[PDB]
Amino acid sequence: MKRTYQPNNRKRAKTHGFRARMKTKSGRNILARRRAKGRHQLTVSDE
Amino acid sequence: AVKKYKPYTPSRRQMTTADFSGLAKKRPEKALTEALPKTGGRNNRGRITSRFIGGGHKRLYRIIDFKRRDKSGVNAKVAAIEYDPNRSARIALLHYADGEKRYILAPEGLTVGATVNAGPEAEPKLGNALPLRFVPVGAVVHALELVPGKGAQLARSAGTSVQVQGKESDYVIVRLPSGELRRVHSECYATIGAVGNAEHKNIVLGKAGRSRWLGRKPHQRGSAMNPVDHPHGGGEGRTGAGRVPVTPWGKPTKGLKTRRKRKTSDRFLVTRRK
RNA sequence: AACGAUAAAAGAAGUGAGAAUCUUCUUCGCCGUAAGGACAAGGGUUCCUGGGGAAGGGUCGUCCGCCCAGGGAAAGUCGGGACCUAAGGUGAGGCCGAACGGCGCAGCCGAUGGACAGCAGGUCAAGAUUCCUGCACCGAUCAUGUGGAGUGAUGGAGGGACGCAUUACGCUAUCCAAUGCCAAGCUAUGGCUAUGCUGGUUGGUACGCUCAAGGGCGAUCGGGUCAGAAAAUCUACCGGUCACAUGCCUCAGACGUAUCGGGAGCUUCCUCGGAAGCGAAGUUGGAAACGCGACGGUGCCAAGAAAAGCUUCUAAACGUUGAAACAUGAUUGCCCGUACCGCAAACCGACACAGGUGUCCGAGUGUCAAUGCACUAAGGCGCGCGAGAGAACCCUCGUUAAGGAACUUUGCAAUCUCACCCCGUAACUUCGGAAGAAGGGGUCCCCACGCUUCGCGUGGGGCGCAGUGAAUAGGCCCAGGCGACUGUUUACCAAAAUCACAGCACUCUGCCAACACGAACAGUGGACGUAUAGGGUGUGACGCCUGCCCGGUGCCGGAAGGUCAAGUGGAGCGGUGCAAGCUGCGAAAUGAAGCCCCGGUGAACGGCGGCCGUAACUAUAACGGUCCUAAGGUAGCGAAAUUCCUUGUCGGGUAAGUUCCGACCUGCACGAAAGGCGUAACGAUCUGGGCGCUGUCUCAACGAGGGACUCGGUGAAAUU
RNA sequence: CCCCCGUGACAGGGGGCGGAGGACCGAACCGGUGCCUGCUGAAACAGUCUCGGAUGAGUUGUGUUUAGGAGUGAAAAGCU
RNA sequence: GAAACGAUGACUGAAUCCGCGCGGACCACCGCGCAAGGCUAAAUACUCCCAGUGACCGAUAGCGCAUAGUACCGUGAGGG
Ligand SMILES: [Mg+2]
Ligand SMILES: [Mg+2]
Ligand SMILES: [Mg+2]
Ligand SMILES: [Mg+2]
Ligand SMILES: [Mg+2]
Ligand SMILES: [Mg+2]
Ligand SMILES: [Mg+2]
Ligand SMILES: [Mg+2]
Ligand SMILES: [Mg+2]
Ligand SMILES: [Mg+2]
Ligand SMILES: [Mg+2]
Ligand SMILES: [Mg+2]
Ligand SMILES: [Mg+2]
Ligand SMILES: [Mg+2]
Ligand SMILES: [Mg+2]
Ligand SMILES: [Mg+2]
Ligand SMILES: [Mg+2]
Ligand SMILES: [Mg+2]
Ligand SMILES: [Mg+2]
Ligand SMILES: [Mg+2]
Ligand SMILES: [Mg+2]
Ligand SMILES: [Mg+2]
Ligand SMILES: [Mg+2]
Ligand SMILES: [Mg+2]
Ligand SMILES: [Mg+2]
Ligand SMILES: [Mg+2]
Ligand SMILES: [Mg+2]
Ligand SMILES: [Mg+2]
Ligand SMILES: [Mg+2]
Ligand SMILES: [Mg+2]
Ligand SMILES: [Mg+2]
Ligand SMILES: [Mg+2]
Ligand SMILES: [Mg+2]
Ligand SMILES: [Mg+2]
Ligand SMILES: [Mg+2]
Ligand SMILES: [Mg+2]
Ligand SMILES: [Mg+2]
Ligand SMILES: [Mg+2]
Ligand SMILES: [Mg+2]
Ligand SMILES: [Mg+2]
Ligand SMILES: [Mg+2]
Ligand SMILES: [Mg+2]
Ligand SMILES: [Mg+2]
Ligand SMILES: [Mg+2]
Ligand SMILES: [Mg+2]
Ligand SMILES: [Mg+2]
Ligand SMILES: [Mg+2]
Ligand SMILES: [Mg+2]
Ligand SMILES: [Mg+2]
Ligand SMILES: [Mg+2]
Ligand SMILES: [Mg+2]
Ligand SMILES: [Mg+2]
Ligand SMILES: [Mg+2]
Ligand SMILES: [Mg+2]
Ligand SMILES: [Mg+2]
Ligand SMILES: [Mg+2]
After folding, report:
1. How far is the CA of B25 from the centre of ligand 21 (A)?
2. Which end of chain A has fewer beta carbons closer than 10 Å to its terminal beta carbon, N or C?
3. Domains of chain A, first to last
4. Secondary structure of chain A as H, E, C letters
5. Are A34 and A46 in contact (CB under 8 A)?
6. Within 7 Å: CB of B175 and strand C?
7. How long is the CA B11 to C1' C193 vector, in angstroms?
8. Angle (CA) B138 B130 B147, round 5°
């Protein structure tokens, strides 16, 4: 049957993207929080 | 008056349709058709607000002018009577010797090819746009505005009449289709006559579908819902309320007045609607 | 245990340390509106070449979608951008808000849409509307000529500009036929010796007085300021005028000619088999699109985007011996996308998983038609364990004496029925229907005759058990309950009598409407709607109807009075100081809405009921009916989806009937929009009965296939 | 719509023609009725057979909006 | 609470030297005080980073890491 994850480049970028995350204080707060954890993958646009 | 249908499908007996044989078969004016997108009854925060709206045929808007003061003095002729989807009334096209084309609500009787004149100096015949005071008493009229030049806000849906009870102060006593009596500034324009279509009240929808074609999503009985959903929800069967008839939000329906208690307009209402 | 669909394999040959698994050959089998082909989304080197073999592969591998290396992807014309706007997202100014922030006109972003110049071929081991060949096209800049006075925006107008169903005429893609044309060779096994057999049979471009259906069509003058902010040869009005049949215009496509390709194959060389060279024919007849002519015709109501490019007109402007416009020539041509998988082993499903994934293409024969069914072409594949056995038992199937629902909770299951033609067809009804009701017949081959052909009718003849000869392919009826109906629902135990529904009623709402989302005097929905509209509530086609009770409660209305908070008013009481004074508490009268109270209100919430007497041991099946709260059941219905007593009582059907039907009325505990009683029709609803048919059964057999068993290979699990 | 037949106060009725429909049989597609299989599955919901819808209240792609006492819901406390 | 005092949201709003504000209702007296105008280092907090030390740990310990926020899981936040 049709499963949850149904890949869509533009979806992913527009939703979990760097521009997206920067558009809001809470997403900015993710960015900083992640940087802090030392993630290789700051954000989806890093893939 | 209305088109009927032999019962060749079950939902085709009761069904009826309007009489279009008097509508000049024309596409609306390219210079007068606007784009009307729909709304689910959703507002700029995205929430359903107006409840049970959706679907239905695609609609273009046809710009109308109600305040005819733009073209007062000069007169036009009736070019045609076309169909408008967003109004109960049929509408009609105007060709001025002036050269401009306009759209005005189309009153009961008024035939194609007639001429019509807006502005204070105009006869009490069908279609003329007169200030209220210049209207002979007891006349039958519609398209009444509530402020001079603001535009017709009263008597617009099919087959509706306003009957001037008669002059007074600066103002004129007016009879509203609800049966309510109102005071209206005599400087306000109006247009002579009953509204038209008029047989509109008699058409029969017939099949669920028709509701949907008119963009009306099905309407949900509270009693079917659940406690969590709505006051009338719950119980172990078909149930009768178990409390006063009440809206989703809890305020009493059936009998509870709602018009705001302290309001400016009140000293212009001479008799309540009844 | 299992090795992931029961579509299927066999031999030879090669390779190799090793082969059931790799390679080649010959066959066999399976898909063929697909299991073939082409896009999109997604994936990311998985493509090609050469090598490799630890692990990955449910066995094995010498192989691979795995591992290593190197190659491979080419665009002015296809798609995106340098153009356009939709929903939506944004958004200086501007409107709101403890903060972060929420809105928000123009403008702007935003394809899933508008716009827009290139076709036919060839070929890498791997690219192709990109490269190569052949001939076109587009804008831009310049030069030479035709120049010889206009160019026309950031504003105007035209235009772009749009629905559903149905349908006439012409054509193409494309497929069929043939003693048309062309090419090849053969004679099989009894015959054929070609009139047999196999294969092929025109794509682009240009021109052409050839053919051509269909499709597009007003012109001009003048007037009116007031319309387009203004302007205006443009647009819209009004008026005048112009030979209706049409011509004016276009040419899908056809024919012809010429030319550029392609073309069955032929040849030659040769290196687990490719390289180059060459090249025949082009018919007549028929079918035919959802494609093209096309923005066609007709009918319908629910009434079917925007903006730019485009055409037209002025404003301003610079010009008016270089203005547009044209012709030829040269020049120029950005950015990203193109490999490969792409109904799947390469995407989503932890897997090389029986699932899921949007669009286009999708041949032939047979069949009323078809994207159905059978077989098949092209193409693709035999599903990455195998071999034997031929027990129980299990799954999926074939048939089954006599009987035929005796099975069972229930005909659950399985059978019977099955397409097309003709004949024929009930109660009942809203006159549409029920209806394919029911039921009966026909169906194949040859020949002649007739007719409108692919075909059919008629007659006669023929063969078999049987002629929709195989596959696709309704079992029917009688009678209840519920819901009118098509629809909808619990992803993953309920599809229904649930919900929705058209119709009906009550009520609110006069527009900054009620109502609703909101930090909010923002903004928004309602609605660019206006009481024939909008919200909320209940009922649920249709028909006949929809009774009694306003005491309690809730709503609408009333008002003498009793009322009631802050406050207004402080009579009066105390504190302190020697005192002017400062100061603690504080009574009347007055004082809003609201409650008390009066009336109204049921398609408002609701109510329409307690009960009187029996022979004997502190007691069971049965009883006829008077009637307290505001009232105490009008119709219709009743042992009911409602009945405790209960298998009520009678009748029906049955050999026998706790179920079903009808009637009865003693309704524990029906009843009128929480609708009452009916109702044709509709139902994967529920219930009872019948006909037919059957392994459901008496009662099980025989058969088949897939497991289970045996051998070689890989080898889990819950539990303990 | 075109011809034809009927006049008790009567719609009607026949023929041509037209091509309507929450019409019908049925594939794609959408759906899940019933039985069996499956139940350490081929699969964390399926398979074969059977069945419902199949011009509509239809199915579907893309872009986008709505959310946690909140959304959304032809209403199952379903779905998020 | 007998509720002083500061503090503002609403309404209202005086004296400037014999004047003003306090001293826990309130008055007298006795005491302390110069509101409505601004800046100010030092002692104090913390520890990403650096150095020294340790009756701290030595590979299941010690940071999650003898290094990695990687592999891996999740649409994501996030986990690891
Ligand atoms: Mg309703
Ligand atoms: Mg419910
Ligand atoms: Mg509640
Ligand atoms: Mg309730
Ligand atoms: Mg085994
Ligand atoms: Mg296998
Ligand atoms: Mg096998
Ligand atoms: Mg050898
Ligand atoms: Mg094999
Ligand atoms: Mg060989
Ligand atoms: Mg395929
Ligand atoms: Mg790529
Ligand atoms: Mg292996
Ligand atoms: Mg080797
Ligand atoms: Mg490969
Ligand atoms: Mg080129
Ligand atoms: Mg915004
Ligand atoms: Mg696009
Ligand atoms: Mg193009
Ligand atoms: Mg383009
Ligand atoms: Mg045709
Ligand atoms: Mg052809
Ligand atoms: Mg022949
Ligand atoms: Mg012979
Ligand atoms: Mg623009
Ligand atoms: Mg490719
Ligand atoms: Mg899985
Ligand atoms: Mg496999
Ligand atoms: Mg698969
Ligand atoms: Mg086809
Ligand atoms: Mg076929
Ligand atoms: Mg088939
Ligand atoms: Mg083949
Ligand atoms: Mg393949
Ligand atoms: Mg038998
Ligand atoms: Mg027998
Ligand atoms: Mg029986
Ligand atoms: Mg059955
Ligand atoms: Mg009949
Ligand atoms: Mg029959
Ligand atoms: Mg015989
Ligand atoms: Mg026979
Ligand atoms: Mg069958
Ligand atoms: Mg139903
Ligand atoms: Mg149904
Ligand atoms: Mg379920
Ligand atoms: Mg079910
Ligand atoms: Mg009062
Ligand atoms: Mg009996
Ligand atoms: Mg009975
Ligand atoms: Mg009912
Ligand atoms: Mg073994
Ligand atoms: Mg239908
Ligand atoms: Mg469903
Ligand atoms: Mg104070
Ligand atoms: Mg150790």
Report:
1. 29
2. N
3. 1-47 (1.10.287.3980)
4. CCCCCCCCHHHHHHHHCHHHHHCCHHHHHHHHHHHHHCCCCCCHHHC
5. no
6. no
7. 76
8. 95
